[model samples]
Target: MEMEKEFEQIDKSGSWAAIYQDIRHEASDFPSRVAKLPKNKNRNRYRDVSPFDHSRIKLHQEDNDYINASLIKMEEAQRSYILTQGPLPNTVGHFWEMVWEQKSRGVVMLNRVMEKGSLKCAQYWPQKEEKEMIFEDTNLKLTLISEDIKSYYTVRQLELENLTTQETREILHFHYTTWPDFGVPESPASFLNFLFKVRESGSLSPEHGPVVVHCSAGIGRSGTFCLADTCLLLMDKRKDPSSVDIKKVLLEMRKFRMGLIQTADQLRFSYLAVIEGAKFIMGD
Candidate 1:
């Protein structure tokens, strides 16, 4: 009932309209930049999925090679993130290349390899007992060193090796399997724990590069998690989170990528999660 009441409140406001207006105003210049690049028919799973030239991650080894990914920087929270789409069959090689070049420490995956008879995401990592998956394009090898499975998510300890340099570094993969079928998590506890688990490793620290965050489209749930996490961090540092301006934060995030927080339900869920997280931090 409370959720419904909050939903009603969000409906009466014109927040969505303001957001759309900003999006449309920016749309004039957005598509042209993304359009200038040569289209790789096989690199993306969907026709509509393309990376913005401004913040998109580029392969230093190859020019104009597109990866459906963008770097989202949250300076205030000291969180740097790469918002990207699920890897395509052929783009797996490019995926590791981005991870390698960016010096990323972790990947926050929010989708499944196959779900509901649809292949929403690619199995971008090595499987059970597999020694290593080679990306011949980049001469990089990904080896699975350990795995921990939980009720709603799984944590994998993996390493990326550059065969050329004979160098290797461990990367954390946080996979989330539970976002309510039509909405967000039923409770923030699990989601919060999953988030803290990632933080506990200091992978998100500025000492490392941005943590890569993605879902099927690299928006939606991906955006929600980032927003809620940012607000929680702000709230803990201050007495309240309202001053942080959730809508403003969402708009800032969208500037880096298109269409974050896909639905009003997602927006509402972000608020709920932030509020719940604040409670947890306050010991209330």
Candidate 2:
């Protein structure tokens, strides 16, 4: 009940951006750096959330530097993730190219096709049971095998093929459906279940390439999802998680990507989820 009392002090009315940090992102020379990359400058949907060039993932096949994506590595906890924005209609090719180059086994999507009457993410994945969706620009073909739809999330098995090399691999596409545009999930139970759903697949294990996590801008909801997953891992490792510091961990993540938890509500909810999830792990 102590945690519940803490919740009482927070605004239950929905205004929670009050505590969101200004985050003077590490790279102040971002403009000049972005100007140098041909593809990256125009690819990013949001101007303010550019990936830092140093930690940005480079496509081995492409001559130009890939834009709007970063390879975030948490060496201590054994998590490597590629954080990027929602794919554009035009950049869908670039998006697939990144997947192919990175050899990522899973893609965690935090947004939907449309949100609040606005298009947040393009329908990037293949249609249900579709034979193949080809992005000829990048010579990649995506074929859907099966889809398991839960109330709040969907797990899809897709075959990602590189036509040029005639190589094919199955990828897991984990989509979280009910999370609101600018807020947190309704409860931690569903969210923890979803997190473990991905974990059970072993896609997030170290043996595979980094898993990709993204929302609209790839910061707000995406950041929250990764933080929860990372914290739960850290907590699960400890016999006592009460002493873990969430704020410090999140700040460490922001070093790899800007503006992770977008609002006070999100930051607060992360703590709530971590606390409950730690207990859930211990309860076993």
Candidate 3:
């Protein structure tokens, strides 16, 4: 229950501010900076070349519908909280320490690594396991990484094929993709397609926990993914077309998680990514 209690405190107290500032100060002293990737103009090529048109973008609305309907039916459903620890000055190392402290207090913390190299680093953790159950609340999804793509779906299929972990189940499906270049389109259609998969796979079980998504240093890719998921949840609640102020959101996340999106470039990318992604979704 420590995880649940901590999550409730975070949601209610909004104590993330102090934590963000502390980490930002520590991150300022780091030596190497996060690598910045140039914005690719050809990112949208996948959609243009595909048979799907912008009309396909509407599919996300249905995904949103499912989320809302599910939430309504399960108001007491456990929710996933997103936190960020910025990269720089060995932020991940610091985050690991913090995670240890949290886990010591009985929180079921799951570290999500989205890169092969990062996975290698994570193996050093004492409790590191090749496979673990990801919870979305009561939905449970089993996740594992493999060099071979054929074995990649084994964990996913196993969850779908089995009827275990019915109590307190929630799924946090994980995968690694070099996105934009991940061969998915850069258009809204492509994004919708991706979101559809997340929603479908994410909701398959009743115990899916917050999708723990991370890339290197848990900043760029992780920030984008977490931001999108949070916005989606908020959109359902607000039911307004207006966009969430992502900078504020990111800053807030940095508070509790520390060093999250620490570098200027990471911050800028996250801001732009969320804004651009929102524009794509809203057609603004």
TM-score of every candidate? 0.87, 0.88, 0.40
After TM-score superposition, the amount by which residue 81's alpha carbon in candidate 2 deviates from its true location, in angstroms, is: 1.2
Q: Which 10 consecutive positions of candidate 1 have the poorest summed lDDT?
A: 27-36
Per residue, candidate 1 scores C-alpha lDDT tens digits across 1-284 of 22334446656884655654554455323552653445666776656655667878778864555778888887777777888888888888888988899999999998888766789877889986465788887799999999999998999999899999999999999999877555566677788888888889887888998888888888888888788888777766765544667767777877777777777667667777776676676666
- TM-score, ranked from best to worst: 2, 1, 3
Model 1, stretches more than 4 Å misplaced?
1-8, 11-29, 32-36, 238-240
Regions of model 3 farther than 4 Å from truth: 1-79, 82-155, 158-172, 179-196, 203-207, 279-284
Instruction: Write down the RMSD of candidate 1 (Cα, Å).
Output: 3.4
> What lDDT score goes with residue 258 in model 3?
32
- Global lDDT of each candidate: 0.77, 0.78, 0.34
Better of 2 and 3 by TM-score: 2
Question: Clashing pairs in model 2?
Answer: none
Per-residue lDDT for 1-284 in model 3, tens only? 21234435644776555544544665322111111112312212111111112111111222221100001011222334333322222223333322222221111112333333334123312222366444332132333322223211212222211124342222233343324412222433433334445555643233533243334334445555555555544544554635455445555444333344544444433434444455444444
CA error at residue 71 for candidate 3, angstroms:
20
Model 2, backbone clash pairs (residues 3+ apart or across chains), number: 0
* lDDT of model number 3: 0.34
Candidate with top lDDT is 2
